[PDB]
Design a protein around this ligand. Structure first.
Ligand SMILES: Cc1cc2nc3c(=O)[nH]c(=O)nc-3n(C[C@H](O)[C@H](O)[C@H](O)COP(=O)(O)OP(=O)(O)OC[C@H]3O[C@@H](n4cnc5c(N)ncnc54)[C@H](O)[C@@H]3O)c2cc1C
Length: 388
């Protein structure tokens, strides 16, 4: 029966634990692995918007998410001299409305894992080799131990090792949006209280906020550049590039960058999307950022993780575990919605900033209203199957 189908789910992010939840509810027996020792606390703030709030409510986690939600009371668009151009209440500022909610990644993953407490999960574990034939997926773990599974679902993130192990370069594109993102935590030296400030120039944006930790602030940097690093994973090159890019910005960036050396969560990356004609090969499926990452400029990644998890599990349910049928349906039903959400990110990468002009109240307000409306349009733009 479907209960006896062996399914390996790789990574304890959003998509992995969510697809594990739905597979179990739908009569399958998934197991999870995670390379890290434990769920990473804190991290980036994730949005649940549009159709994804329905899925969260059905999973029984929506109230728990709302209990752990981000608490920004107001955001402000400020000029480099600290004048307020435009102020919005926190949810509106974040382009959320209605039942939509924002939660730090680590707090969401904790809730997801509490909802699957019955599902076996092994941390400090990773797959170093995958081979498949018509009957089985043979997995080799890091220590050489081998196990066979009927299916493997890889939720291992935008940099996914499984994608590289399974697919060739002809089978996916890494779409570079021409921009970089960086974030790090510093002492809250301004004494912000549940508030975010956002300052921009033609090609760059800087945010500073304090929310759940009164003595900490999170800094963020997004900027368009055609520069390529010698080694994009070299952290000292990243910090020199960030510093050089922002040396002339003004506002709080000297105060922020002067505290960068002592921050312990530093994050830097190119803004990239994953475009695949097929997320699946044989008995192996990619899901979440590994398959379809829309990039942070979209603000939809978490939504795509939730929707992908629901659809892949439900199509396996409706196929009674026939993965050839279900994987085809997974690809066909979800690609347009993924493409819409990725193209929203592309749009942000191209039109959010004012190329030739200085921001004003009128521009920030009209832009904010437009994004709110476009995101509501794109985030509701799938007719979600009903699998029960
Ligand atoms: C700067 C930034 C800002 C963002 N802002 C937003 C936003 O405003 N709204 C929004 O909705 N989304 C946002 N996101 C996106 C959100 O973080 C992702 O879309 C979401 O986390 C997708 O989850 P996932 O489960 O696909 O992957 P992830 O959450 O990345 O989890 C993948 C997991 O797999 C593990 N793993 C990796 N490799 C292996 C391996 N080889 N073996 C085993 N385990 C492995 C990882 O440690 C990790 O726990 C942002 C992301 C970033 C980086």
């Amino acid at each position: 029966m479907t209960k006896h189908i062996k399914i390996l789910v790789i990574g304890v992010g959003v998509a992995g634990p969510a697809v594990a939840y739905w597979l179990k509810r739908f009569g399958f027996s998934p197991v999870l692995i995670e390379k890290s020792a434990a769920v990473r606390k804190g991290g980036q703030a994730l949005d649940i918007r549009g159709i994804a709030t329905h899925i969260a409510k059905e999973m029984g986690i929506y109230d728990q998410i709302c209990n752990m939600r981000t608490q920004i009371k107001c955001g402000r668009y400020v000029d480099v001299k600290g004048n307020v151009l435009h102020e919005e209440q926190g949810e509106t500022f974040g382009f959320r409305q209605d039942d939509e909610v924002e939660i730090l990644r680590g707090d969401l993953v904790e809730i997801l894992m509490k909802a699957i407490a019955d599902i076996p999960c092994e941390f400090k574990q990773s797959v170093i080799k995958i081979e498949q034939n018509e009957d089985s997926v043979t997995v080799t773990y890091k220590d050489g131990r081998v196990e066979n599974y009927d299916l493997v679902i890889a939720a291992d993130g935008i940099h996914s090792a499984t994608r590289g192990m399974v697919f060739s370069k002809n089978e996916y594109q890494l779409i570079n949006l021409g921009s970089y993102v960086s974030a790090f935590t510093i002492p809250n030296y301004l004494g912000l209280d549940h508030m975010e400030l956002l300052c921009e120039s033609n090609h760059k944006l800087v945010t500073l906020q304090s929310d759940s930790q009164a003595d900490k602030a999170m800094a963020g940097f997004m900027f368009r550049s055609k520069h390529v690093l010698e080694d994009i994973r070299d952290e000292q090159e990243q910090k020199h590039f960030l510093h050089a890019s922002f040396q002339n910005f003004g506002w709080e960036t000297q105060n922020i960058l002067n505290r960068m050396p002592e921050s312990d969560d530093f994050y830097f990356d190119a803004i990239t999307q994953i475009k695949m004609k097929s997320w699946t090969k044989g008995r192996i499926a990619l899901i979440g950022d590994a398959a379809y990452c829309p990039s942070p400029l979209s603000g939809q990644g978490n939504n795509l993780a939730f929707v992908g998890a629901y659809i892949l599990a439900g199509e396996l349910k409706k196929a009674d575990g026939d993965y050839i049928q279900a994987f085809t349906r997974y690809n066909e039903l979800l690609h347009p919605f993924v493409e819409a959400n990725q193209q929203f990110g592309v749009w942000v990468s191209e039109s959010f900033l004012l190329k030739d002009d200085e921001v004003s109240k009128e521009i920030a307000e009209a832009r904010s209203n437009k994004i709110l409306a476009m995101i509501k349009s794109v985030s509701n733009s799938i007719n979600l199957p009903q699998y029960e």
